[PDB]
């Protein structure tokens, strides 16, 4: 499929480590499955992929808020 954001790159199946900063705290969200644009790096995650990703995101946010 063509990337729905940059309209030139192709979407490919992959696993990526995703940097994230929340309330000034920096982390890398490891091993996130999804489709990724080879050109602009836009991600497309289906329901199951989104659930896994957001579990990581929310665990990180919770830890930051409690610290
Ligand atoms: Zn793209």
Author numbering: 1 to 67
Please share text taken word for word from the publication where this structure appeared.
Our data show that, as expected for a TA system, the expression of the MqsR toxin leads to growth arrest, while co-expression with its antitoxin, MqsA, rescues the growth arrest phenotype. In addition, MqsR associates with MqsA to form a tight, non-toxic complex and both MqsA alone and the MqsR:MqsA2:MqsR complex bind and regulate the mqsR promoter.
The zinc, which serves a structural and not catalytic role, is coordinated by four cysteines (Cys3, Cys6, Cys37, Cys40) with an average sulfur-zinc distance of 2.35 Å. The interaction between the two, long twisted β-strands and the five turn α-helix of the MqsA zinc binding domain is stabilized by an extended hydrophobic core composed of 11 residues: Ile18, Tyr20, Phe22, Leu29, Ile32, Tyr36, Met45, Phe53, Val57, Phe60 and Val64 (residues in beige). The DALI server was used to identify proteins with similar folds. Thus, to the best of our knowledge, MqsA-N is a zinc binding domain with a novel fold, hereafter referred to as the MqsA fold. MqsA is also the first antitoxin described that requires a metal, zinc, for structural stability. In contrast, no shift is observed when the DNA is incubated with either MqsA-N alone or the MqsR:MqsA-N complex.
